[PDB]
Every structure is written in C-alpha cells, then in structure tokens.
Design a protein around this ligand. Structure first.
Ligand SMILES: O=C(Cc1ccc(F)cc1)Nc1cncc2ccccc12
Ligand SMILES: O=C(Cc1ccc(F)cc1)Nc1cncc2ccccc12
Lengths: 305, 305
C-alpha cells in the first residue's frame, strides 16, 4: 500500500555526471562512452547570451579551454562539436560506468526523473512531467544546467532531458539529448515566457485508478459519459483532450479496478464541477497529473531495475 | 526556483542492495563491508508470525540456510547473529561498492529517502518523513521488507530506516539499522495499530518559509502570537506542539526572510482557520509537513525572492 511520487533509481546516471568548465562558467555534463554532453551556452559570457553566435564563439575555443572533471579526475578534451543546442566534447577516456542507454525525445504528459546536479555532483532526484506547454516544474538553482532527465525500461537508461534555463515564472526549459528544445524556447537571454498550461487528463485518470487501487473510492459514482461530452468538459476546465489512445492505454487499470475509463471520466467531471468537498485523494486536495498510466502500473506492481 | 519533494541520489545505496532468502521467504538485505543486514522475520513462516520466538527459530539455522544473492553472484554466509529485530549475516566478501556510511536513529519529523527494492533490486526512490506516531507513509508492496531509508548529507550515507511491515491502515513500520523499532511496534502479526497521527508543525513552518523564499507571501498577516497561544490553537487541528527547540531551529530561515518565527506561527494559525481560499502554496492546496528546516535550507536559494 501507499502511493508516492517515485523517481527511478539514479545510480546509473550518477556514474555519468561530470563538471564542465569554460572560462568563468561551470555547469554539468553527461559523460557517456568518450563524449561529454552539455548545454552549448557554457561557452557564453552574460553579454554573449544577449545575442549569441555559437559557431563564432565555439571556433575561438580550443579543446584545452574546456575543463572536464569526473569526480577528482580531470578528463582531457580531444575534440568538440555542436549538435543543435548541445555541445559534445570528445574525451580521451570512455566512461567505464557508461550504462546501456538511448537518447529518446518524450511527448508532453510523459514523466521522467531528474537528477539535479551542481559542479558535476548529484544533489537530488525528483520525478516530474513534461507539461503540455513544454516546460517542467523543476527545482533548480544556478549551476544546475546540464542536469538530466531520464527513464529506465528494463536495464536501459533512456535520457530524455537536459536542463538549460529557468523562465521568469520559475519553471524550466531544456532540450532532448540531441539538443532540440522542448517547446518554443531558445538559448538566449531574451524575453521568453511559458504559454498557458493545461492539466494532463490521462495522467489524472491514471492517478484516480491508483487511488482506487489504494482504497480511496469516495469519488466513484454510478455514472458514465461519452468521450465527446467528457472532452467538452475537459476543454472548459483547461484539461488536455482525452483521445481513444488514452482510453486504450487506461484499459489494464480499468480491468483491474472494474471501473470503465468513461466511468472514471464521469467521476473526474464531477470533481471538476463540484471540487473535493473538503476531502482528499491519496493525500492531495488537487487532482494530480504527474503520474502516467505506466507509472501507476509500475508502482502498483513493483517493477525493478 | 521551484520546490519539489526531493530524494537523495540513490546510487550509493543501490550498490548495497542484495536478496536474502531463508527457506521459502525472500526479502532485501543491505550489504555493507562483510555484513548483510536484514529483518529478522526472514527466518519466520507466516504461521511463526503470531508469537515467534526468534532466538528459538535462529538457533535451528546454520550459515548455509541463508542464501544471499548480490546481482547474479551468490555470497557465502560465514556467520549470523541477531541484534534486536535485525539479522546480521557475515559474508566472505566485503562489498566493493560500500560507501562511507553511518547508522543514525532519527526522531519523528525527520525526513529521509527510501529506496524501495524487491528481490534485491531497486525499484524506485521517494522521500518520506518519520511521522509523529512513528510510522512512515511509504509505498511498499509484498517483498519490500529490508528496503532502507537514508540521508546523504556530503558523500556519507546515514542509514536510518529498514522496512519491516505494513500496518492495517496501509502505513509502514520499521527499525533503525541496529534493529530497534521506531514506535511501539513489534515484528509479530498480533493486533497493532498506529496512534493518532498529527501534523509536523515545525516542518509546515519550514515549508511556509520555503514559499516566502520562492516569492509567495499571500498567507502572511500583520499579527504575531505567543508560543503558548499558538500551541493551544494548533493542538485543536491535530498539529504537534511547537517547542522552543523548533523555534530555535527555524532561526536561520527567519533571518533570511525577515519573518519572525512567531509571526510565521500567526500566519499558520490563520491558514488553519481560513483554509487556502482557492489558492496554493508551492503547488499544494494542503499544508505540507514532510520538508524539514534543514531540507528547505538545502533545496532553496540562499537569496529570497
Ligand atoms: O537560466 C539559467 C541561465 C540561462 C540559460 C539560458 C539563457 F537563455 C539565459 C540564461 N540558469 C538557471 C537554470 N535553472 C535554474 C536557475 C535558477 C536561478 C538562476 C539561474 C538558473
Ligand atoms: O508486512 C509485511 C510482512 C510482515 C512482517 C512482519 C510482521 F510481523 C507481519 C507481517 N510485508 C509487507 C511490507 N510492506 C508492504 C506490504 C504490502 C502488502 C503486503 C505485505 C507487505
């Protein structure tokens, strides 16, 4: 019993974190095989960030301008190149701790664990979701750039996020490990803002199934709804549309609890229109949307890595 | 910016998790140096659990009755002893991955990370707090016994909890790493129940200071309170008494934000009286009590917004 915001075990990623220093800027790098990946803005001064020409800034740097420290050992940079918003520093030593890995680009609504790092040293691990507005509500301070997001499926770490910046509302923006930003953001000190966010409907439904599995049923009702009527209500409350794909993905949870997906949708509609009436669900007074259907099944079944 | 329920990176603990088997029972063990620590109830059958005589059950065992598996390698047990409710299995191999560590017994209100494991394999990591009634609201399924709670301030792992059982309300009971249970619980299947749980007042205050540091002040008021009047009100909402020790511990946060501890107590009193009126504090519609003053200082910026 119990239901917690659970992150993947971070050990496989901790063994990849390094410190990358270029001039006065120090941030984190991810060392996989003989390459260290880090945000390309490590080469910028605060002045350069106003309007940077990364190719022009990079051509002025030699391999020795990049100081890479893995624990208490300095790695020697033997090559450097840029791929989108990520700098790839070729080093002479392959990371002996390199896990089985892949670079995967995730979609809004998908969750992942973030290993927050400072000076190449892991500080904490937390679970978060890629918001529909492509930001993450992370917890990062100065020096956290280059910290990564990941999932684990079997024994393979799927790296999906690299931290680049904090937006004025305190939310965070970054890229996949190929340097493509999530969302309409750029790596430049210029006016940028997160768009209006919405709630990840399929995830709220998954969390309602988790509450039922954990013995919280007060919100269940005898009613059902159509996908179109539910989607009209979801649009009204700034909830993402629920698709037939989402309904299909919730199938196993629906079969285990005996509550049809559209039956859980009628429960959600009632919660949206009436609130919780002083009650909580899994210790929350808000509808939680940062657990996917897969996260719920994994946590309620004890999958290991 | 941002404020998340953040766990310590689990890598140092993942490298210590092993599987312990005694007959038909399999659970987790913590392998540090040449000793594997695990719940003593691994030697019990479900029948033995009403009134087990652990001394009598253990005397019938030899070293070869304990099967310890570290990854895909069987460790050889060369000695066994019981210390309170933990079994210590001496093995013929020191764990090469043993981190710098200590065994620390924590007090209610203290937080820690839990690395949930099944069959000696880590499944997830989450943040927990030792409740005032000495239980933890974990997320644990059958097979999770032997999973541990820890803190990693610096490069030293302070092990503070070992999971032993789930109580009828779905909450969890365990011991420190010397085998002493937290709370009035026993490793017996006799009827046992958690005492009435209360809110960890000092932690709610710490979290209100975290909200002020991150830029939110809507909940502040022009009032102060005496410590005794605060406690008289707070006890009516099932909040733990706030002691002068708690007021002293909140000193640094009070100095950083400029809000006196008793001035924050007045805000808390008003929040208990009024509720949030549709507002949230750090993304929560409830008053959060699983962040300590130390957690807030570690996570938050040293510069208030
Ligand atoms: O945002 C930047 C620097 C930066 C990057 C790209 C860019 F376009 C402009 C500035 N770093 C930070 C990242 N995360 C949390 C932070 C908290 C506080 C301060 C800085 C943080
Ligand atoms: O509680 C026990 C076994 C046990 C130990 C000591 C004792 F005296 C009685 C029973 N195991 C479990 C631990 N945690 C979560 C669990 C969820 C579901 C089922 C079993 C769980």
């Amino acid at each position: 019993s119990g239901f917690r915001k659970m992150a993947f075990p971070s050990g496989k990623v901790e063994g990849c974190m390094v410190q990358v220093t270029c001039g006065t800027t120090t941030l984190n790098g991810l060392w996989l095989d003989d390459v260290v990946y880090c945000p390309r803005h490590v080469i910028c001064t605060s002045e350069d960030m106003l309007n940077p020409n990364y190719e022009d800034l990079l051509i002025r740097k030699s391999n020795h301008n990049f100081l890479v420290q893995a624990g208490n050992v300095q790695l020697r940079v033997i090559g450097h190149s840029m791929q989108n918003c990520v700098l790839k520093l070729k080093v002479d030593t392959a990371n002996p701790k390199t896990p089985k890995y892949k670079f995967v680009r995730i979609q809004p609504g998908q969750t992942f664990s973030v290993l927050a790092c400072y000076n190449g040293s892991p500080s904490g691990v937390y679970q978060c979701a890629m918001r529909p507005n492509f930001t993450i509500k992370g917890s990062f301070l100065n020096g956290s750039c280059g910290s990564v997001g990941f999932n684990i499926d079997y024994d393979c770490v799927s790296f999906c996020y690299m931290h680049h910046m904090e937006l004025p509302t305190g939310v965070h923006a970054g890229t996949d490990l190929e340097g493509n930003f999530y969302g309409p953001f750029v790596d430049r000190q210029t006016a940028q803002a997160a768009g209006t966010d919405t709630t990840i409907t399929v995830n709220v439904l998954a969390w309602l199934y988790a509450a039922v599995i954990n013995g919280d049923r007060w919100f269940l009702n005898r009613f059902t709804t159509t996908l179109n009527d539910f989607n009209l209500v979801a649009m009204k409350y700034n909830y993402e549309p629920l698709t037939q794909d989402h309904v299909d993905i919730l199938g196993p949870l629906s079969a285990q609890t005996g509550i049809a997906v559209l039956d859980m949708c009628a429960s959600l509609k009632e919660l949206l229109q009436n609130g919780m009436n002083g009650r909580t669900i899994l210790g929350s007074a808000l509808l939680e949307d940062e657990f996917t259907p897969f996260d719920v099944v994994r946590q309620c079944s004890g999958v290991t890595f």
